[PDB]
Structure 1
Amino acid sequence: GGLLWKIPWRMSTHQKTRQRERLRNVDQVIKQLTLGLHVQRCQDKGLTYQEAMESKKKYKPRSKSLRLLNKPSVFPKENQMSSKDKYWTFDKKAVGYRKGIHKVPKWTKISIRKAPKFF
């Protein structure tokens, strides 16, 4: 009411592009972690780096966090996500049950990917 926190209700094209890149970067981090674990498993079994990378059979991670992060239904990749959920986040105190993801504190660091099926 009194203070002027002039935060617009919708993002711009540049903001959307940056958000897309950030999502992609997190996806890349997850992918690299899994690949490193796979190569480590191969090297422990005896193979070397070259055919560890070229191995037809890729070893899946055995930790809960990595397995869940790799499941698309838990942490969908950027290209899998919907345009709505790329930029809008779920709020139960807002008309339409949505708010711009840029109104979340520290939104460039924290990650949101999934909202309720019917919201």
Structure 2
Amino acid sequence: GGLLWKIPWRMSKFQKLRQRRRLRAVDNVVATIENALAKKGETVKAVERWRAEMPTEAEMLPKDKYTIFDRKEKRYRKGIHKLPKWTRVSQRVNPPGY
């Protein structure tokens, strides 16, 4: 190609700090909504699905926070900053073994 989209393949230590803090901020929203309902003895299907199949920032591996699964990459991994609107989208789980 000729149109230059200068996107580095890896993130900087400053972007990683904000990715860590963005994952840790979505945990407080799900922990606030999950505890607010438990006091009322209530539950939601989407709040129970999240806690089941999604990990917290303290349970994620570094490669799951800064990378995603791309079948067209050599090692099936791609920088998470390559995902559209990656800053306002949730992406924590990748296919097993990849």
Please tell me whether residue 62 in structure 1 is matched to residue 19 in structure 2. no
Aligned with 1:108: secondary structure?
A: helix
Identity of aligned residues (%): 50
* Residue aligning to 1:82: 61
2:95 and 2:7 map into 1 onto residues whose CA distance is 26
* Residue aligning to 1:7: 7
Please tell me whether residue 115 in structure 1 is matched to residue 94 in structure 2. yes
Q: Deviations over 1:40-99 (max 9, x none)?
A: 33xxxxxxxxxxxxxxxxxxx63321111112xx11000100110110000111111111
Task: Extract structure 1 runs of 4+ deviating beyond 2 A.
Answer: 61-64
TM-score computed with the length of structure 1 as normaliser: 0.78
Paired residues in the alignment total 98
1:40 and 1:107 map into 2 onto residues whose CA distance is 34
Aligned with 2:32: secondary structure?
A: helix
The structure that has the greater radius of gyration is: 1
Q: Deviations over 1:10-40 (max 9, x none)?
A: 0000000000000000011000001110223
1:118 and 1:64 map into 2 onto residues whose CA distance is 28
Provide structure 1 residue ranges, at least 5 long, that are not aligned to the other structure.
Answer: 42-60
1:106 and 1:95 map into 2 onto residues whose CA distance is 24
TM-score computed with the length of structure 2 as normaliser: 0.94
Please tell me whether residue 99 in structure 1 is matched to residue 78 in structure 2. yes
CA RMSD in angstroms, aligned pairs only? 1.1
2:90 and 2:38 map into 1 onto residues whose CA distance is 25
Provide structure 2 residue ranges, at least 5 long, that are not aligned to the other structure.
Answer: none
2:45 and 2:59 map into 1 onto residues whose CA distance is 22
